[PDB]
Design an enzyme around this catalytic site. Structure first.
Site, PDB file in Angstrom:
ATOM      1  NE  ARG A  47      52.640  40.485  50.577  1.00 31.51           N
ATOM      2  CZ  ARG A  47      51.780  40.755  51.500  1.00 31.51           C
ATOM      3  NH1 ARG A  47      50.587  40.026  51.971  1.00 31.51           N
ATOM      4  NH2 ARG A  47      52.104  41.778  52.586  1.00 31.51           N
ATOM      5  CE1 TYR A  50      41.422  32.592  52.628  1.00 34.82           C
ATOM      6  CE2 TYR A  50      43.293  32.595  53.974  1.00 34.82           C
ATOM      7  CZ  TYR A  50      41.928  32.518  54.169  1.00 34.82           C
ATOM      8  OH  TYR A  50      41.505  33.078  54.931  1.00 34.82           O
ATOM      9  CB  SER A  51      47.196  32.440  46.216  1.00 35.70           C
ATOM     10  OG  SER A  51      46.077  33.697  46.226  1.00 35.70           O
ATOM     11  CB  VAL A  53      48.619  36.403  41.793  1.00 43.03           C
ATOM     12  CG1 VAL A  53      48.604  36.783  40.111  1.00 43.03           C
ATOM     13  CG2 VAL A  53      47.658  35.825  42.207  1.00 43.03           C
ATOM     14  CG  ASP A 156      36.547  38.596  47.359  1.00 44.32           C
ATOM     15  OD1 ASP A 156      36.635  39.613  48.048  1.00 44.32           O
ATOM     16  OD2 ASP A 156      37.977  38.145  47.489  1.00 44.32           O
TER      17      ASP A 156
HETATM   18  O1  LIG Z   1      42.178  34.442  39.889  1.00 50.15           O
HETATM   19  C1  LIG Z   1      42.816  34.714  40.628  1.00 50.15           C
HETATM   20  O2  LIG Z   1      42.750  34.936  42.013  1.00 50.15           O
HETATM   21  C2  LIG Z   1      44.367  34.946  40.277  1.00 50.15           C
HETATM   22  C3  LIG Z   1      44.488  35.499  38.879  1.00 50.15           C
HETATM   23  C4  LIG Z   1      43.908  35.024  37.674  1.00 50.15           C
HETATM   24  C5  LIG Z   1      43.813  35.860  36.816  1.00 50.15           C
HETATM   25  N1  LIG Z   1      44.742  37.159  36.998  1.00 50.15           N
HETATM   26  C6  LIG Z   1      45.341  38.107  36.183  1.00 50.15           C
HETATM   27  C7  LIG Z   1      45.513  37.802  34.612  1.00 50.15           C
HETATM   28  N2  LIG Z   1      45.795  38.463  34.049  1.00 50.15           N
HETATM   29  C8  LIG Z   1      46.418  39.987  34.425  1.00 50.15           C
HETATM   30  C9  LIG Z   1      46.318  40.064  35.805  1.00 50.15           C
HETATM   31  N3  LIG Z   1      47.140  40.852  36.549  1.00 50.15           N
HETATM   32  N4  LIG Z   1      47.896  41.894  35.867  1.00 50.15           N
HETATM   33  C10 LIG Z   1      48.415  42.638  36.491  1.00 50.15           C
HETATM   34  C11 LIG Z   1      47.861  42.578  38.001  1.00 50.15           C
HETATM   35  C12 LIG Z   1      47.861  43.234  39.039  1.00 50.15           C
HETATM   36  C13 LIG Z   1      47.319  42.705  40.384  1.00 50.15           C
HETATM   37  C14 LIG Z   1      46.622  41.571  40.278  1.00 50.15           C
HETATM   38  N5  LIG Z   1      46.129  41.073  41.260  1.00 50.15           N
HETATM   39  C15 LIG Z   1      45.935  39.646  41.352  1.00 50.15           C
HETATM   40  C16 LIG Z   1      44.364  39.517  41.562  1.00 50.15           C
HETATM   41  C17 LIG Z   1      44.103  39.768  43.272  1.00 50.15           C
HETATM   42  C18 LIG Z   1      45.619  39.830  43.915  1.00 50.15           C
HETATM   43  C19 LIG Z   1      46.318  39.127  42.959  1.00 50.15           C
HETATM   44  C20 LIG Z   1      46.517  40.621  38.969  1.00 50.15           C
HETATM   45  C21 LIG Z   1      46.881  41.374  37.843  1.00 50.15           C
HETATM   46  N6  LIG Z   1      45.863  39.219  36.862  1.00 50.15           N
HETATM   47  C22 LIG Z   1      44.731  36.539  38.397  1.00 50.15           C
END
Ligand SMILES: O=C(O)Cc1ccn(-c2cncc(-n3ncc4ccc(NC5CCCC5)cc43)n2)c1
Length: 332
Positions: A47, A50-51, A53, A156
């Site tokens: 999390r 602002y969001s 996930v 970022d």
């Molecule tokens: O583009 C975006 O912001 C969301 C966004 C778009 C693509 N992702 C994306 C795509 N594929 C896998 C993941 N995973 N897989 C495991 C995992 C563990 C943690 C996270 N953390 C996220 C990234 C920051 C905190 C949440 C992602 C994680 N995230 C995320």
């Protein structure tokens, strides 16, 4: 006392200037929604403020996806991330925005991205070899050079926002919630990026920054990989963040930096910046990181981590550093 000195990006200075207004004017962007009934949350990934996930599945084809459910923030703040992801879509190593839906529960916009079988960076980095670091760093330069040349600053860059599918050597730069278009002369909010990857221009409060900000943040990751110390500059806050940097690059160049841009250094620094000599990168080498350190590795890092953003290397120039010669230059 007086006023700060202006600055301009050395590259891609007017890419938006000559583009169709609609391209950068996200505020007037009209979002087209998709069918949220199409996706289902399967597991929380993490999390933020602002969001939130999650890992999800497209119920119509079983395709795995990642859904980012936003939190109230302002339509403008929303349109900005959407406009950007669409302008970059297709770009090298840029996460792909697959859809945009209205989340019934949260009643806010939920973005759907391509999913990457990511390996926790906290574990992945301990196993990375010298070639891998060079390799992934290079992949991140692509997305960086692409978004920069498209008039966009990420703002970022950090491990957390770089997804990696190691077995497939696939990397994607994610989370463009703080990304903004670059307009020469404009003064930006310095409250961007995350502490450990914040650039001196942010720590000193200089607003007329540019894409070079991502190069520092990228420099911070490199250092933490070749030295196996994540994060590298562990500040307790933004002020102490600069101190930690000062303690490595030394205080002389720092002051040369504010003198040059005639920056008004916050009083709170006086009592904490102290006096530190520029340390040699060798001081961070040990029996556990030696195999990951090389002259080209230090020369490169050295050109990424500099107070004056202007002197920093651009992503495009960085891709030319001897440190990447090997990186199996595709060719085919
Ligand atoms: O583009 C975006 O912001 C969301 C966004 C778009 C693509 N992702 C994306 C795509 N594929 C896998 C993941 N995973 N897989 C495991 C995992 C563990 C943690 C996270 N953390 C996220 C990234 C920051 C905190 C949440 C992602 C994680 N995230 C995320």
């Amino acid at each position: 006392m007086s006023g700060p000195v202006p600055s301009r990006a050395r590259v891609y200075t007017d890419v938006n200037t000559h583009r169709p207004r609609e391209y950068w004017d996200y505020e007037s962007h009209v979002v087209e929604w998709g069918n949220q009934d199409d996706y289902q949350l399967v597991r929380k990934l993490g999390r933020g403020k602002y969001s939130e996930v999650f890992e999800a599945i497209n119920i119509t084809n079983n395709e795995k996806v990642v859904v980012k459910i936003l939190k109230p923030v302002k339509k403008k703040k929303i349109k900005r991330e959407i406009k950007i992801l669409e302008n970059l879509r297709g770009g090298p190593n840029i996460i792909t925005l697959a859809d945009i839906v209205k989340d019934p529960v949260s009643r806010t916009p939920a973005l759907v991205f391509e999913h990457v079988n990511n390996t926790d960076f906290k574990q992945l980095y301990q196993t990375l070899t010298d070639y891998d670091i060079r390799f992934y760093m290079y992949e991140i330069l692509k997305a960086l050079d692409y978004c920069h040349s498209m008039g966009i600053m990420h703002r970022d860059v950090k491990p957390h926002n770089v997804m990696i599918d190691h077995e497939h050597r696939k990397l994607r730069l994610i989370d463009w919630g703080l990304a903004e278009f670059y307009h020469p002369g404009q003064e930006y909010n310095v409250r961007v990026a995350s502490r450990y990857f914040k650039g001196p221009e942010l720590l000193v409060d200089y607003q007329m920054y540019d894409y070079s900000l991502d190069m520092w943040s990228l420099g911070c990751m490199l250092a933490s990989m070749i030295f196996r110390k994540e994060p590298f500059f562990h500040g307790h806050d933004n002020y102490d963040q600069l101190v930690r940097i000062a303690k490595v690059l030394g205080t002389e160049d720092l002051y040369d930096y504010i003198d040059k841009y005639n920056i008004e250094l916050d009083p709170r620094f006086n009592d904490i910046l102290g006096r530190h000599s520029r340390k040699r990168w060798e001081r961070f080498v040990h029996s556990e990181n030696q195999h990951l350190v090389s002259p080209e590795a230090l020369d490169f890092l050295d050109k990424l981590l500099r107070y004056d953003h202007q002197s920093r290397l651009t992503a495009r120039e960085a891709m030319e550093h001897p440190y990447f010669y090997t990186v199996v230059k595709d060719q085919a």
